[PDB]
Amino acid sequence: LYFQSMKAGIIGAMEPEVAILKEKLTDAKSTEHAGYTFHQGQLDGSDVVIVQSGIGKVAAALATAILIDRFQVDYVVNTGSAGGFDASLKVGDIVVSSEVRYHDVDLTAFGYEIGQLPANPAAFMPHDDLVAAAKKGIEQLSQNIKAVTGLITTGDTFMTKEEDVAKARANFPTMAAVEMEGAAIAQACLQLKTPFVVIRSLSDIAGKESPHTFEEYLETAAVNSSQLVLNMLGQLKGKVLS
Numbered sequence: 001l002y003f004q005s006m007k008a009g010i011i012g013a014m015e016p017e018v019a020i021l022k023e024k025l026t027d028a029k030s031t032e033h034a035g036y037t038f039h040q041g042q043l044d045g046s047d048v049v050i051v052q053s054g055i056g057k058v059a060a061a062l063a064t065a066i067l068i069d070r071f072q073v074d075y076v077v078n079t080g081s082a083g084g085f086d087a088s089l090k091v092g093d094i095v096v097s098s099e100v101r102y103h104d105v106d107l108t109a110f111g112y113e114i115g116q117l118p119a120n121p122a123a124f125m126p127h128d129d130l131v132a133a134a135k136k137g138i139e140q141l142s143q144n145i146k147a148v149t150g151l152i153t154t155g156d157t158f159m160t161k162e163e164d165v166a167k168a169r170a171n172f173p174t175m176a177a178v179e180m181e182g183a184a185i186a187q188a189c190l191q192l193k194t195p196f197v198v199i200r201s202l203s204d205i206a207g208k209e210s211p212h213t214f215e216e217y218l219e220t221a222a223v224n225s226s227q228l229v230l231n232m233l234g235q236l237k238g239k240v241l242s
């Protein structure tokens, strides 16, 4: 009958990235702390807390901290949209983080790696089992989408200027996709000894077409990322993280 499951923290920067899972919430309760709105409930039996963070590093990191400190989630899933870097991937595809780095952190002047904050690893690491879970989570099939593991990077600039995309690409050649909150969530999670995984779907190919492509395909990327979350929640049912 009843599964014994962890409590999942689920975070998205904007309302569409979160609206779907917010809906399928059962026994919904919504609470407010420190300027954020947290939606506690269940998804197919599993206990979750869903928060829309706002855009950018600091906002995502603060929501994450409250998510962990106030609601004691066992792990954090960051979901949402991202700009594709990997040419193999096309709008709607999904990238599960295999690692996450900031692209807009630079303390190389002092010997740190590009993207790396002092007293932090160069790359934040998602839990293997959360990664493994979403890997199996690709029984995807709605009723076709590609889904991959790859490097995801994070900065506080929306990545549109051919020059910005080039510099990022040069520093982080293996990058599958880019967004504005992933590494910040991971940074907060590390600080709070909490497992994370970042799941993001391509709302655009990063570059000249990005602003209107993003607006066109945000709802698609929300649908696809939200689905892989639900599956991943299924794979984690009755399990605990190693």
Ligand SMILES: Nc1ncnc2[nH]cnc12
Pocket (backbone or CB within 6 Å): 081, 082, 083, 084, 157, 158, 159, 160, 178, 179, 180, 203, 204, 205, 206, 207, 210, 214
């Ligand atoms: N091109 C882009 N840059 C940063 N974040 C994004 N999220 C979706 N598309 C993006």
